[PDB]
Amino acid sequence: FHNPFIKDGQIKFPDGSSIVAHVERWAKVRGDKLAYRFLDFSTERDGVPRDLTWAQFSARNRAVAARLQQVTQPGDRVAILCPQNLDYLVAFFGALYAGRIAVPLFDPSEPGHVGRLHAVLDNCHPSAILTTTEAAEGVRKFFRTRPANQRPRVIAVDAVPDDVASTWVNPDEPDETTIAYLQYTSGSTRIPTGVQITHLNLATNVVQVIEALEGEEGDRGLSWLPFFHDMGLITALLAPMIGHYFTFMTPAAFVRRPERWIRELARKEGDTGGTISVAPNFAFDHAAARGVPKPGSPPLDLSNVKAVLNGSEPISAATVRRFNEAFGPFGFPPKAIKPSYGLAEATLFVSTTPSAEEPKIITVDRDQLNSGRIVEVDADSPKAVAQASAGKVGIAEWAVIVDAESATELPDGQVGEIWISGQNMGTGYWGKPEESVATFQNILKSRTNPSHAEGATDDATWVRTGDYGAFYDGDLYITG
């Protein structure tokens, strides 16, 4: 394995950092290869695939982009309110193609979406809404509950002919400030927090994920999570940078029959590589409980699974044991479970376990962990408690444990606030100048010897994650 974007430990972008340039490249050299597939379980139970090749994907992207360039201006924000299907990605990439700031959200009519859609739209004030014909009515209804002066143009992406792309203008190469999209994430503030993720942020973090998971050509990506999610888009954005196709289903499709995700994770005949996917802790439990094939099932081979990214709350030892007990007999490698630390402020990925290692879980003093120190004890101990690792910090980014008040790096084992830095870090919160400075632009005033900030410059900006944790024995631990 070798990362095509890394040269001498440095992330190099020869063909720019435009993910638009990457998609167009595949559309030119492998236009007839599969790019994106949506497993539709709305009608049938084993699902019918909706496919979209690289050239087809480009055709739809440029068509929507051309329409957006007629009704929006550079700097405008375009909210994506499609149902979870192919048209969602068409809309999202379409907004990027148009040279506008995408805002990945959700169809209001779709159930199981957590987020204050009203307050979010209040924050970014989009000039256009992207949806589908099937959902356009529900969208128009939702906006009737909003003031008249904030009911922006609604565009059904599937209603835009392919030949519209004829007038599409490719936006000039973006610098390091050009915002690709706004990623809104959970918070307790009244005004929702939308991380400004630049094209440089996107490309950098995708590369950092590729490096961490040893992603290659031949590796296909899979996801069931809603696109509006801290880890909802990363696997999809992986496909254009790596050149292999991405497969997805609705969240509800997974909840109904989690075996569908297990099946798609499994080896297909013709596979030259592994499967990469994402699943929070509860998803592992749900799959282990309801996603194991009945007796008499067709062969299930999970020996191909490369990485299932699991974030961001610490994975349970009980969950790890249960999932391996359930799918281990089907060939599932324990090392495929990749516990990780991630957040929207860093685009997503910050740390995960090494490629050849299983989830590291250690037994530490329960109350000493409460006193702010990580100390290993025996399993027999009455003060014993299991604590799972978040692995090691990815390439071209740093994480440090600091004393929050004095901005001073702490010795290993000691719990403090986690500060992070790198080119994947967002450039602020939309519409929150002061909150942006406070969170994204901190200076590290003191380092230990050795330091976890080794490689970072003095004027490197550090992100106050708000999370607390500690380094222990070469691994990062999130404790709060």
Numbering used by the authors: 3 to 482
Which lines from the publication concern this structure?
As our own initial studies indicated that MtFad32 tended to aggregate, we decided to crystallize FadD32 from M. smegmatis (MsFadD32), which has 74% sequence identity to MtFadD32. We determined the structures of apo N-MsFadD32 and ATP-bound MsFadD32 at 2.4 Å and 2.25 Å resolution by molecular replacement. ITC results showed that ATP bound to full-length MsFadD32 with a Kd value of approximately 36 μM, while AMP (control) did not bind to the protein; Moreover, the N-terminal domain of MsFadD32 (N-MsFadD32) alone could not bind ATP. Superposition of the structures of the apo and ATP-bound MsFadD32 revealed conformational changes within the N-terminal domain. Firstly, to accommodate the adenine moiety of ATP, the side-chain hydroxyl of Ser314, which forms a hydrogen bond with the main-chain carbonyl oxygen of Gly344 in the apo state, rotates 180°. Secondly, the side-chain carboxylate of Asp232, which forms a hydrogen bond with the side-chain hydroxyl of Thr187 in the apo state, rotates approximately 90° to make room for the α-phosphate of ATP. Thirdly, the P-loop moves a relatively large distance (5–7 Å) to stabilize the three phosphate groups of ATP. Of note, the conformational change in the P-loop is accompanied by the extension of a neighboring α-helix where Arg118, which in the apo state forms hydrogen bonds with Thr191 and Arg192, forms hydrogen bonds with Thr187 in the ATP-bound state.
